[PDB]
Structure formats: C-alpha cells, structure tokens
Structure 1
C-alpha cells in the first residue's frame, strides 16, 4: 500500500526479471548436469 512498499515490490519484480536469464542458465546447467551424472554413473552422495 505504501509508496516505499510499492517501490520495494517493483524492485523485487525488476530483480526477478534480471535474474530470469540467470535462472534459465541455471536450469540449463541443471539439465546438463543431471544428464552427465546419469550417463557417467556418478552416483550422488547419500547426504547430497
């Protein structure tokens, strides 16, 4: 409701928009890593 709160929400939205590309890069990295760890049989750590 407040102007400062609206500006904070807008800043959060802008940060999410800026980090959308980083999140897509992380998603691609996760997909490639899941494929590689599966293919090589590199078993995940039990606590991992």
Structure 2
C-alpha cells in the first residue's frame, strides 16, 4: 500500500498543476497563433 499511496499523492500533487498547465496551454495557443500571424520562421527544432 506504500506504493499505492505514493502514486496517489503524486497524482494529487499533479492535480493542482493541472490547471496551471491548462492555462499555459491556452496562453501558448494564443502566443503560437499570434506568432503565426506575426509570420515568424519557426525553427526546424520547433515542436508543434
């Protein structure tokens, strides 16, 4: 049960970061679309 409790505490720690990551996703959607409409050459190493 120690492994299970470690897993569940790790995921509940992830729970709070879920919403910050979601707002990061939204702001980066905004930023990427802005950069596209600013027409910047995305490097080959850019991850879509």
Whether TM-score is above 0.5 comes out as yes
Q: Over aligned residues, Cα RMSD in angstroms? A: 1.3
Unpaired stretches in structure 2, ≥5 consecutive residues: none
User: Structure 1 stretches of 5 or more lacking a match?
Assistant: none
TM-score, structure 1 normalization: 0.74
1:6-44 alpha-carbon deviations (Å, 9 max, x no partner): 111111220221111111111112211111111000111
Structure 1 runs of 4+ aligned residues shifted over 6 Å read none
Larger radius of gyration: 1
The answer to which structure, 1 or 2, has the higher relative contact order (CA under 8 A, 6+ apart) is: 1
Number of aligned residues: 46
TM-score normalized by the length of structure 2: 0.74
